[PDB]
Amino acid sequence: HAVPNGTLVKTITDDQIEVTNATELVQSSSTGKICNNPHRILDGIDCTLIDALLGDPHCDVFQNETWDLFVERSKAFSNCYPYDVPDYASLRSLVASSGTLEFITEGFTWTGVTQNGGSNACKRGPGSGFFSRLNWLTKSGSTYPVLNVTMPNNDNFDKLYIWGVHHPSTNQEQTSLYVQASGRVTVSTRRSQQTIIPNIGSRPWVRGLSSRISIYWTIVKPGDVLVINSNGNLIAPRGYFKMRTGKSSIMRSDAPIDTCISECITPNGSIPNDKPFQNVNKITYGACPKYVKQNTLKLATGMRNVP
Amino acid sequence: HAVPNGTLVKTITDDQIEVTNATELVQSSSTGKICNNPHRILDGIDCTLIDALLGDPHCDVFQNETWDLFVERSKAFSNCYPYDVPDYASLRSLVASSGTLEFITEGFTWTGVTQNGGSNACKRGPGSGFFSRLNWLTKSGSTYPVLNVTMPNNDNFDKLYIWGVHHPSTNQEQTSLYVQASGRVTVSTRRSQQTIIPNIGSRPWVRGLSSRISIYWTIVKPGDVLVINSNGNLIAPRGYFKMRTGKSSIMRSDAPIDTCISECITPNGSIPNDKPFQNVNKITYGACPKYVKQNTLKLATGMRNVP
Amino acid sequence: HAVPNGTLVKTITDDQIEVTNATELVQSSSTGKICNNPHRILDGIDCTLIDALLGDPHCDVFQNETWDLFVERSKAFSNCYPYDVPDYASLRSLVASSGTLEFITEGFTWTGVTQNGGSNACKRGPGSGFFSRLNWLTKSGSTYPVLNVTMPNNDNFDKLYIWGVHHPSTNQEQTSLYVQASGRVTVSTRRSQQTIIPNIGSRPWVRGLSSRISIYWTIVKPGDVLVINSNGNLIAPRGYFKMRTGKSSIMRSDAPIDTCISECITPNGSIPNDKPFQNVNKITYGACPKYVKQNTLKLATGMRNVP
Amino acid sequence: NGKLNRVIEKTNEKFHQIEKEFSEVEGRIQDLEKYVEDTKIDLWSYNAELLVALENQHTIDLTDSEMNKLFEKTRRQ
Amino acid sequence: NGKLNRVIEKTNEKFHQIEKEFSEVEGRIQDLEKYVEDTKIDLWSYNAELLVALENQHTIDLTDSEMNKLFEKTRRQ
Amino acid sequence: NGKLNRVIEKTNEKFHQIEKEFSEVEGRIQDLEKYVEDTKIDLWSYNAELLVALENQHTIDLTDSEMNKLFEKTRRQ
Amino acid sequence: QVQLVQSGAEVKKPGASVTVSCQVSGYTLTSYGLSWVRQAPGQGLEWVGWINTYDGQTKYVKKFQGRVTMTTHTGTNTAYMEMKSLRSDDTAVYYCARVEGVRGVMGFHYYPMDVWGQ
Ligand SMILES: *[C@@H]1O[C@H](CO)[C@@H](O[C@@H]2O[C@H](CO)[C@@H](O[C@@H]3O[C@H](CO[C@H]4O[C@H](CO[C@H]5O[C@H](CO)[C@@H](O)[C@H](O)[C@@H]5O[C@H]5O[C@H](CO)[C@@H](O)[C@H](O)[C@@H]5O)[C@@H](O)[C@H](O[C@H]5O[C@H](CO)[C@@H](O)[C@H](O)[C@@H]5O)[C@@H]4O)[C@@H](O)[C@H](O[C@H]4O[C@H](CO)[C@@H](O)[C@H](O)[C@@H]4O)[C@@H]3O)[C@H](O)[C@H]2NC(C)=O)[C@H](O)[C@H]1NC(C)=O
Ligand SMILES: *[C@@H]1O[C@H](CO)[C@@H](O[C@@H]2O[C@H](CO)[C@@H](O[C@@H]3O[C@H](CO[C@H]4O[C@H](CO)[C@@H](O)[C@H](O)[C@@H]4O)[C@@H](O)[C@H](O[C@H]4O[C@H](CO)[C@@H](O)[C@H](O)[C@@H]4O)[C@@H]3O)[C@H](O)[C@H]2NC(C)=O)[C@H](O)[C@H]1NC(C)=O
Ligand SMILES: *[C@@H]1O[C@H](CO)[C@@H](O[C@@H]2O[C@H](CO)[C@@H](O[C@@H]3O[C@H](CO[C@H]4O[C@H](CO)[C@@H](O)[C@H](O)[C@@H]4O)[C@@H](O)[C@H](O[C@H]4O[C@H](CO)[C@@H](O)[C@H](O)[C@@H]4O)[C@@H]3O)[C@H](O)[C@H]2NC(C)=O)[C@H](O)[C@H]1NC(C)=O
Ligand SMILES: *[C@@H]1O[C@H](CO)[C@@H](O[C@@H]2O[C@H](CO)[C@@H](O[C@@H]3O[C@H](CO[C@H]4O[C@H](CO)[C@@H](O)[C@H](O)[C@@H]4O)[C@@H](O)[C@H](O[C@H]4O[C@H](CO)[C@@H](O)[C@H](O)[C@@H]4O)[C@@H]3O)[C@H](O)[C@H]2NC(C)=O)[C@H](O)[C@H]1NC(C)=O
Numbered sequence A, B, C: 001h002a003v004p005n006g007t008l009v010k011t012i013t014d015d016q017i018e019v020t021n022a023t024e025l026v027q028s029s030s031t032g033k034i035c036n037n038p039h040r041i042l043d044g045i046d047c048t049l050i051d052a053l054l055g056d057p058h059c060d061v062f063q064n065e066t067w068d069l070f071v072e073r074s075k076a077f078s079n080c081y082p083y084d085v086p087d088y089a090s091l092r093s094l095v096a097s098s099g100t101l102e103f104i105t106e107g108f109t110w111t112g113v114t115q116n117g118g119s120n121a122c123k124r125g126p127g128s129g130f131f132s133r134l135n136w137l138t139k140s141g142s143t144y145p146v147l148n149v150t151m152p153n154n155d156n157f158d159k160l161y162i163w164g165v166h167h168p169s170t171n172q173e174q175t176s177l178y179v180q181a182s183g184r185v186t187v188s189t190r191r192s193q194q195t196i197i198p199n200i201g202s203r204p205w206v207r208g209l210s211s212r213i214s215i216y217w218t219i220v221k222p223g224d225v226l227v228i229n230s231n232g233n234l235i236a237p238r239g240y241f242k243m244r245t246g247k248s249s250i251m252r253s254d255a256p257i258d259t260c261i262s263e264c265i266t267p268n269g270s271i272p273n274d275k276p277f278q279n280v281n282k283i284t285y286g287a288c289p290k291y292v293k294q295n296t297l298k299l300a301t302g303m304r305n306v307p
Numbered sequence D, E, F: 001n002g003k004l005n006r007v008i009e010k011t012n013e014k015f016h017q018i019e020k021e022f023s024e025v026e027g028r029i030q031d032l033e034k035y036v037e038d039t040k041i042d043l044w045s046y047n048a049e050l051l052v053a054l055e056n057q058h059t060i061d062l063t064d065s066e067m068n069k070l071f072e073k074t075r076r077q
Numbered sequence G: 001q002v003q004l005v006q007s008g009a010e011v012k013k014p015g016a017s018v019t020v021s022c023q024v025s026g027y028t029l030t031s032y033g034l035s036w037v038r039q040a041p042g043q044g045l046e047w048v049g050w051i052n053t054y055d056g057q058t059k060y061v062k063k064f065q066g067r068v069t070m071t072t073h074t075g076t077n078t079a080y081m082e083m084k085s086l087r088s089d090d091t092a093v094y095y096c097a098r099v100e101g102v103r104g105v106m107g108f109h110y111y112p113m114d115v116w117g118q
């Protein structure tokens, strides 16, 4: 049996051969929106993952959030103390894979220092503030004792501690905030240690400041111990982020979230996974078709078309 | 010709079709033991590779050992001075690939320092000891001269020097062991250099100590020169490990070594390599079948079964 | 139809079967020369990419060069101040991918220091010289002010700044060149910073010197700002390298460049890309056949040979 | 039907992967990630092409044989 | 016989490879190693599936043709 | 003709890749690069082998069928 | 300055084996391949062999296959050519010469012997 018009497919021994009926195997178009089911999507409005992690004021809505996919918009910006994350990609990757911002406040005993330091560049409410998940320790009175504190991990989940080192701009500011001429920070565990020597130097003017914060992280495995030993320039943690394992991930996309059902999410939106191959994007999340370079692949579903 | 019972295989155009005789292509079971031939297996009892490398006392049996596959048991532990290896994975990988712990003692001329320093946390025999392949240089009398020693590589094989930096816990211990307030170590060659600034700070209590050793390595190519320049906190090498090239590797497995013949070793034991694909483990050594996700793949070895 | 002699090919169900005519699919031989068209080849005689980048005297011919493939000969050597590039591979890779050595001299205002420092190990002309793309700042008179200079990136292309830190051999030389006992260098941008603490120590004698230069790079994106803050041991940049994007790359090969046409260049020379697979080398540039391990693959182009 | 169920059992379910878009220029690691992704994409594109070609070939061969057989039998009857 | 000798020439002999099990969490490099291993495993699983399917198809086609030919010839004799 | 145009569309055009030859010994990253390159080479070698085998099989089957058909028709005439 | 300094004169007996060494100076031995050329007294030059430093792959003339071995001690920037089963016809001057190509190509196919030992 034959049909009037036919579709041209390609075989081992033929560039083009006409057949009665042929289907497409490459999903090359996207709906343009991200379905919010079944995957727990978290739309990050104006907030990058690290900003919500640290506790940027305009990100206070993201506290204790959880997600199956964190969509990070291109309009996101930082509006707090100018910070800098050495190995930013690794921290972002592991935080995103953990899949929760659940922050447990721990009781740290800082003796002889002024806690809750703040700045005018990070304005919380009407007054000066700081990152909600960090604690800026400054000299109390006229001394800055060598802080030496510890926290044991007695639970059976990893703990993620986010701390930082404050690089001042001028030596006067260094000695005004921390009486030592050049302090250092050392966060260590049983298996590894990490020491930072803060430097003093002017930096490009960002949000009214020349000083910076360097953000580091330390993962305390179960049964391990954290020891923080510093004599200046320490941005102490306030607690720990509960690390996890799961199917969580992060994605950079400006697609709007929509109320629908779909399993495969690309930055171009949710796409159906009926077809085995897709050409939309090479970044995928969920049960997605395999990305291919071709924009069309015709599978013959009928007999050779001889009309 | 036909048979009473048949095996169901899968083709291009059939999910299940019965055939007279069908063979299996996936090796999904392991004998559970590691055959000790023909590959030169080295069972590491209670010793990690790095521990045997450094010369941990309870690893003194591993001196000058060679292997084609170092099996590293999960029960291994360290019972010496608490050390720490930045880039631990790289050092372990290259030592394992070298395939020999052959250590050649070189004559180093340390003038004005007390050699063979030891500690009670690393008890060799009845008394205090240290790693057999390292030399803890401390102040002699009341001074610590700036050590500046050299060794040329006149042989045509790479030399591997393992040295370390001692981080003391307290400033008093720093000045008691090394008169300089804050020394440093610098090991350099013609092509590269490496400098470490030891820090002083309390660390999590491990085996009765708060101080640490940071273990670094330096590879001196043929015709090159090593220069060690330090003014404190130096754990000098005693000689060099003869680097090599070969088919050597390392594996983490608790399988017991057994007397038999087999070419393919996985952490689950030795497996036969007659079948082309295997499903046991994705970590393999030797002429091993390619790992696949499927647990069964039936190859038809007969005609279609029409009984 | 049949032929007297035939070629043995391999199928799904036959190890060897004779056929009338069979073609080869693996290109296993190379012409031995590198065709200089259409790809803009740059033969680097006695000059490595980094040496031409820095401005080694015997590489002054490579200034403002551009290439589609930089061929780096095995005879290349350095004949200037003994330098060292931490993360050498990354710098070489990104410079090679940029595809141009176009250097724009910028006006840097170094106040209170002696510019154009030179050395006898890097002899330009008859007298002492230095790298043409670096500026060795030494103390002027008897002081060395804390240099704090800036350059904004107002153009819409990336800028690549190459700077360096001078490690002296002896403390006397340190205080003779830079009055500070131990200076430091800090090159920072809005998004990242990089600080180096120069060390003082003797190093293996190379080209008459024990001191070294550590070469670092900083990429200033459009709209960003560079701030250089140092108080000693600074090898300042003179300008910026215009970064680009393109099909540029680098190759290590001693093959001689030849006047001909070819698209696929391997270290063994230019090879034709008519065949789909090649066995010459796994390093390729251009539209090259896919590398395979087999040295022969016969494709049947005729009927079964029954003579 | 779909006919690819036997060859590709299902759409495998991947959640966390490497970065495939980079803003700045890092060097070795970024080049490695780009190379890995490009290698994977090329291999999967080739696999898709070959699979489609094989399925088309076998489908047309089968349908052609059936058409020819039915024509012969109907002509003989 | 085994019939796979022609397609897979032998079991290639690999000695030193990357780590495929990790204790702690590192970040970029660990993710890259995991991704590389997963990519390799998926590609080899697909290759194995397709190879088995092709061999089964050709074996059954060949045996079916032989059975049919012998039946026709014996019936004609 | 070449007959591989359909399966391999063209020679894909690669410009900048990872290092595939190393002088010294680095460790993790060098091992990762070596492993990635070896994996790619093995997969492409297998793909080439299988593609050649399939093309040879189909070519010989087709030519054999044509030879047999022409022999039968000429004998009948 | 690029210099090649060879061993001293050797006096041997037939059937023995000799080892001629070539010490390079002014450059790194692995940057250049090294050819060995003999000259019987008043009989013109005769190419003996070629050692590819940096990968050790050799190439000898069929006349010398098996009875000539070239190795490179990279530590001392030295290269050794040993001849086993010496004959009377092997009395000659031996020169080590520097050739350019080591990576990608066999050097002597395309490059000359720019620097010679004594
Ligand atoms: C296209 O160009 C390429 C580039 O030149 C050609 O590739 C070369 O091809 C030749 C011939 O096919 C190869 O030589 C053959 O090698 C085998 C065994 O080789 C094994 O070792 C090789 C060298 O290892 C040394 O060098 C490397 C790199 O420098 C170093 O990392 C090693 O550690 C080792 O170093 C030692 O030697 C140095 C120099 O003396 C010392 O300084 C040092 O201290 C050490 O002592 C190695 O390259 C080779 O293959 C590896 O690398 C390739 C990639 O090139 C990869 O594919 C492999 O998987 C390996 O990873 C092996 O490991 C040797 O046995 C052969 O000898 C034959 O001939 C002699 C006499 O002629 C007989 O006595 C033998 O019995 C045997 O028959 C032969 O020498 C060469 O190795 C290869 N690569 C290089 C870099 O040169 C390619 O051939 C060209 N193709 C065409 C078509 O033109
Ligand atoms: C080391 O060297 C660096 C680089 O040269 C110096 O850094 C500069 O420091 C000065 C002051 O210390 C900074 O000047 C300030 O710039 C701010 C940003 O201005 C930019 O953006 C505005 C729009 O927001 C534009 O209009 C403007 O043209 C710039 O493009 C200004 O907002 C600041 O203004 C404040 O102070 C002035 C002072 O008169 C008042 O008039 C204003 O009303 C306001 O209160 C000020 O102008 C400069 O930006 C820094 N540059 C960089 C790149 O960081 C270091 O100071 C120097 N340190 C030492 C110790 O030498
Ligand atoms: C900076 O801050 C850190 C953290 O707070 C301090 O580190 C602690 O230092 C103290 C002493 O300096 C350590 O105390 C010692 O702990 C050892 C380990 O005990 C653990 O394990 C045993 C079983 O093995 C358990 O029973 C016990 O509960 C612990 O869980 C003990 O073995 C030591 O005992 C010895 O000393 C005591 C002193 O009275 C004697 O009674 C004993 O007989 C024995 O001789 C001792 O108790 C403590 O472990 C450290 N903690 C960590 C996390 O390292 C630094 O000291 C501090 N430094 C400064 C300068 O402030
Ligand atoms: C810390 O420790 C290191 C290592 O021990 C010392 O480094 C050595 O320093 C000395 C001098 O300070 C260096 O000696 C010089 O070596 C040069 C290189 O010589 C090599 O190469 C030549 C051929 O080019 C060979 O002939 C020679 O045997 C060597 O193999 C020489 O060229 C120098 O000669 C100059 O000075 C001498 C001095 O008498 C004159 O006679 C000469 O005519 C010429 O002017 C000189 O011999 C030595 O090379 C360094 N070694 C290394 C490995 O770097 C540090 O000095 C030391 N520092 C401190 C503070 O203790």
Ligand SMILES: *[C@@H]1O[C@H](CO)[C@@H](O[C@@H]2O[C@H](CO)[C@@H](O)[C@H](O)[C@H]2NC(C)=O)[C@H](O)[C@H]1NC(C)=O
Binding pocket: A003, A020, A021, A022, A023, A301
């Ligand atoms: C070719 O086959 C496709 C696949 O079934 C047919 O598309 C379906 O057609 C039916 C008509 O009864 C619809 O109900 C389905 O929704 C269609 N599915 C899709 C995915 O399109 C198509 O009609 C066939 N064409 C011809 C000419 O036979």
Ligand SMILES: *[C@@H]1O[C@H](CO)[C@@H](O[C@@H]2O[C@H](CO)[C@@H](O)[C@H](O)[C@H]2NC(C)=O)[C@H](O)[C@H]1NC(C)=O
Binding pocket: B003, B020, B021, B022, B023, B301
């Ligand atoms: C199906 O084929 C397999 C493969 O040969 C047969 O298994 C072999 O059978 C012989 C019997 O003579 C034994 O000696 C071998 O040891 C068997 N080998 C293996 C790997 O099992 C099997 O007998 C065949 N089955 C049928 C029903 O014909």
Ligand SMILES: *[C@@H]1O[C@H](CO)[C@@H](O[C@@H]2O[C@H](CO)[C@@H](O)[C@H](O)[C@H]2NC(C)=O)[C@H](O)[C@H]1NC(C)=O
Binding pocket: C003, C020, C021, C022, C023, C301
């Ligand atoms: C087998 O086929 C090849 C491919 O065409 C033939 O090689 C060509 O032969 C023609 C002769 O007319 C030459 O002009 C071409 O230059 C050849 N091309 C190549 C790439 O070799 C070959 O002659 C055929 N052999 C037989 C016996 O038929």
Ligand SMILES: *[C@@H]1O[C@H](CO)[C@@H](O)[C@H](O)[C@H]1NC(C)=O
Binding pocket: A004, A005
């Ligand atoms: C169907 O056939 C008509 C002519 O009969 C032709 O114009 C058209 O392009 C064919 N395809 C479709 C989708 O209409």
Ligand SMILES: *[C@@H]1O[C@H](CO)[C@@H](O)[C@H](O)[C@H]1NC(C)=O
Binding pocket: A063, A064, A102, A103, A104, A105
């Ligand atoms: C977040 O959760 C923790 C425990 O799950 C709780 O202690 C804390 O108060 C919560 N914070 C907010 C803002 O809800």
Ligand SMILES: *[C@@H]1O[C@H](CO)[C@@H](O)[C@H](O)[C@H]1NC(C)=O
Binding pocket: B004, B005
């Ligand atoms: C063989 O056939 C019997 C029935 O004849 C059936 O019960 C059995 O499952 C078949 N297979 C085996 C392995 O016995």
Ligand SMILES: *[C@@H]1O[C@H](CO)[C@@H](O)[C@H](O)[C@H]1NC(C)=O
Binding pocket: B063, B064, B102, B103, B104, B105
């Ligand atoms: C190890 O071997 C080296 C040389 O191969 C030798 O000098 C040394 O004494 C040996 N050590 C032991 C414990 O056998």
Ligand SMILES: *[C@@H]1O[C@H](CO)[C@@H](O)[C@H](O)[C@H]1NC(C)=O
Binding pocket: C004, C005
């Ligand atoms: C061609 O056939 C001759 C004998 O007829 C045989 O000797 C030869 O090897 C065959 N092949 C070639 C390339 O000559």
Ligand SMILES: *[C@@H]1O[C@H](CO)[C@@H](O)[C@H](O)[C@H]1NC(C)=O
Binding pocket: C063, C064, C102, C103, C104, C105
């Ligand atoms: C290189 O090019 C820049 C601008 O393209 C120019 O200013 C500079 O003088 C050039 N240098 C040389 C040596 O030609």
